[PDB]
């Protein structure tokens, strides 16, 4: 069972800031990682797949990189609309596991 | 892109009550369906995969069924521990898409 | 006296959603079950009798199924005029008893 550890568990930054979030797998998951955004009271929405491919329609201010067991999610310039909780999930094998999630706030 | 349709959005019931949630896929997903439980403030937890398959450690009071397009998730006896949000997610094809979630509460 | 267990107590869904309501009989009641609709402040109106027979003039989006002690009421596409409290009632023996009812609302 692949353990996903995400950090930090939460942060607050200002509009325009560069935000960064990490997820480490307990095994090489061969780049099968997704980043999801979950707005308060809504279902998670896929942002990035294959570690670094943006889903069609996602703003380019969003980006992911990494490989092996360490992955990185970055938001190059924070918008008020990005206030949500972010999650990484491994899809290298079942059961698909999630990171603990990172709440992103403004201020 | 595959659309998942979940219902109801929220329910309220009493301890021991049977709870029924369903998900509708916009295409045959071949049982490539997962059910997650999301307790407040936490990441989603896989309860069932392959539409009917229980993950180890998950109480037998949970159960899933369905096929092609229609799927159902059932909680045979609502326990206090079961208060959370539940989601179905398709994994037949990327991007993996979620149902809107159902908020389960005890009256 | 025959006890009727109805689930859930209340729910919220969106226009077009499918809605499932359940009723459990503490005894087999040979399909002698009626489903009533009760809008706010009016008397209950019979929608279905004999567990699955639609009364004349009732829309095809309502359906009933079930047997022995397990009965099911479905609305395939929730319309705004469907907002009300639903009740199952057994007519197998006196005194005829009702389920606790299900408050259906739209989010």
CA–CA separation, A83 and A103 (whole Å): 8
Domain count, chain C: 1
**Range C61-70 contact pairs with CB under 8 angstroms and sequence separation of 24 or more:** C62/C35, C64/C33, C64/C35, C66/C23, C66/C31, C66/C33, C67/C31, C68/C25, C68/C28, C69/C24, C69/C25, C69/C26, C69/C27, C69/C28, C69/C29, C70/C22, C70/C23, C70/C24, C70/C25
Q: How far is C97 from chain B (nearest CA, A)?
A: 19
B92–chain A nearest CA distance, Å: 12
Q: Which residues of A touch B101 (CB under 8 A)?
A: 42-43
Is beta strand A97-98 parallel, antiparallel or unpaired with respect to A84-90? antiparallel
SS (H, E, C) chain B: CCCEEEECCEEEECCCCCEEEEEEECCCCCCCEEEEEECCCCCCEEEEECCCEECCCCCCCEEEEEECCEEEEEECCCCHHHCCEEEEEECCCCCCCECCCEEEEEC
What gap in Å lies between CA C96 and CA C58, rounded to an integer? 23
Beta bridge pairs of residue A19: A75
Asked if C86 contacts C48 with a C-beta cutoff of 8 angstroms, the reply is: no
Please indicate whether, in this complex, the C-beta atoms of A46 and B97 are within 8 angstroms of each other: yes
Domain with residue B86: its CATH number is: 2.60.40.10
> What phi and psi, each to the nearest 5 degrees, are found at residue B63?
-165, 150
Cα(C88)–Cα(C4) distance, integer angstroms: 8
Chains C and B share 3 or more Cβ pairs within 8 Å: yes
CB contact under 8 A, B22 and C24: no
First-residue to last-residue Cα distance in chain C: 37
- Select from C2, C13, C11, C25 the least CA-distant residue to C85: C11
Chain B touched by A57 (CB under 8 Å):
no
Query: Quick check: helix, strand or coil at residue C81?
Result: helix
Could you give phi then psi for residue C68, rounded to 5 degrees?
65, -100
| Nearest partner of A100 among A6, A1, A2, judged by Cα | A6
Contact A55, A64 (CB under 8 A): no
Are B6 and B22 in contact by the 8 Å Cβ rule? The answer is: yes
The span from the CA of A43 to the CA of B66, in Å, is 21
Q: Quote the minimal CA–CA distance from B67 to chain A in Å.
A: 20
d(CA C78, CA C62): 9
Chains A and B form CB pairs within 8 A to the count of 41
Reported resolution, Å: 2.1
- Please list every residue in chain B whose beta carbon sits closer than 8 Å to the beta carbon of residue A87: 43-44
Q: Which of B42, B55, B96 sits opposite A34 (nearest CB)?
A: B96
CA distances from B42 to A73, A98, B93, C50 (A): 19, 10, 26, 45
| Domain of residue B80, residue span | 1-107
Method: X-ray
């Amino acid at each position: 069972d692949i353990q996903m550890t995400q950090s930090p568990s939460s942060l607050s930054a200002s509009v325009g800031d560069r935000v960064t979030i990490t997820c480490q797998a307990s095994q090489d998951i061969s780049d099968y990682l997704i980043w999801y955004q979950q707005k308060l009271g809504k279902a998670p929405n896929l942002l990035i797949y294959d570690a670094s491919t943006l889903e069609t329609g996602v703003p380019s201010r969003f980006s992911g990189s990494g490989s092996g067991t360490e992955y990185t999610f970055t938001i190059s310039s924070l918008q008020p609309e990005d206030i949500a909780t972010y999650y990484c999930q491994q899809y290298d094998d079942l059961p698909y596991t999630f990171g603990q999630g990172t709440k992103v706030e403004i201020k």
